[PDB]
Design a binder for this molecule. Structure first.
Ligand SMILES: CCCCCCCCCCCCCCCC(=O)OC[C@H](COP(=O)(O)OC[C@@H](O)CO)OC(=O)CCCCCCC[C@@H]1C[C@@H]1CCCCCC
Ligand SMILES: CCCCCCCCCCCCCCCC(=O)OC[C@H](COP(=O)(O)OC[C@H](O)CO)OC(=O)CCCCCCC[C@@H]1C[C@@H]1CCCCCC
Length: 190
């Protein structure tokens, strides 16, 4: 069986080489890029675990499985809509998966990497992995010190309090949280 390090390295190599070979077709049709993303990342992403992680048990247990699913989709689709093109504009950059001692039989692990971009500007990116029945999957992403999972966890709680714990209202507006997540991170970084 593979280790979380290999699952990361393999996914990075597969996705980057796939984008490089088809960079022209994706720039012309983003729906093709979105499909390839779902095909490559889908198997290695714990979408339901991430959704529940952002909602917290306090709110997920007030939601139906059909509702949690609809929250996954708004999350996925909005992430691709506002941050999918980023994988095309700068796929010329370098990535380095840093060492790790995690074994395949482990139940949890964190895999760190570095992204050298624009003349060598390095930001760390970390992936919190969890070993499930379907193998190792991403459960959280930390970027340059910003716990993205906790960021959305806080935004979800703030929006739920404003909507008087209306899940439907929160889901119908979650696209706007994702769209602003980048500046939300920049402000929290300065
Ligand atoms: C169940 C279904 C699963 C499917 C889910 C779909 C998920 C969608 C994926 C969305 C990807 C997010 C990219 C970050 C966007 C960003 O942040 O916006 C530009 C950035 C800002 O930075 P910067 O401050 O320079 O520019 C800002 C100026 O506006 C200031 O003026 O820059 C860049 O382009 C850097 C891009 C480099 C990223 C490439 C790294 C490797 C790729 C991601 C894969 C690896 C995944 C492996 C998974 C493990 C199993
Ligand atoms: C439900 C489905 C989930 C699917 C999960 C799939 C995993 C995909 C993993 C994608 C990793 C991409 C990392 C590149 C970002 C970057 O290289 O950008 C740095 C800059 C900060 O550094 P700067 O301050 O610019 O440094 C400059 C000097 O300071 C000058 O002085 O931009 C930023 O802020 C980055 C932060 C933007 C926030 C958007 C988050 C979207 C992203 C897709 C993930 C989230 C997945 C869900 C998480 C829930 C647990």
């Amino acid at each position: 069986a593979p280790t979380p390090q290999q699952v990361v390295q393999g996914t990075v190599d597969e996705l980057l080489s796939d984008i490089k070979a088809n960079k022209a077709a994706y720039k012309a049709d983003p729906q093709k890029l979105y499909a390839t993303l779902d095909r490559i990342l889908g198997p290695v992403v714990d979408a339901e675990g991430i959704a529940k992680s952002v909602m917290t048990v306090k709110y997920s247990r007030q939601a139906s499985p059909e509702q949690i699913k609809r929250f996954e989709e708004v999350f996925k689709n909005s992430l691709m809509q506002f941050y999918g093109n980023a994988l095309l504009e700068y796929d010329n950059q370098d990535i380095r998966v840093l060492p790790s001692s995690a074994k395949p039989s482990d139940d949890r692990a964190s895999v760190n990497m570095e992204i050298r971009d624009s003349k060598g500007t390095v930001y760390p990116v970390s992936y919190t992995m969890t070993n499930l029945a379907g193998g190792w999957k991403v459960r959280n992403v930390i970027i340059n010190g910003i716990n993205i999972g906790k960021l959305f966890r806080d935004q979800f709680a703030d929006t739920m309090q404003k909507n008087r714990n209306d899940l439907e209202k929160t889901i119908a507006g979650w696209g706007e949280v994702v769209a602003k997540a980048k500046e939300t991170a920049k402000a929290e970084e300065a």
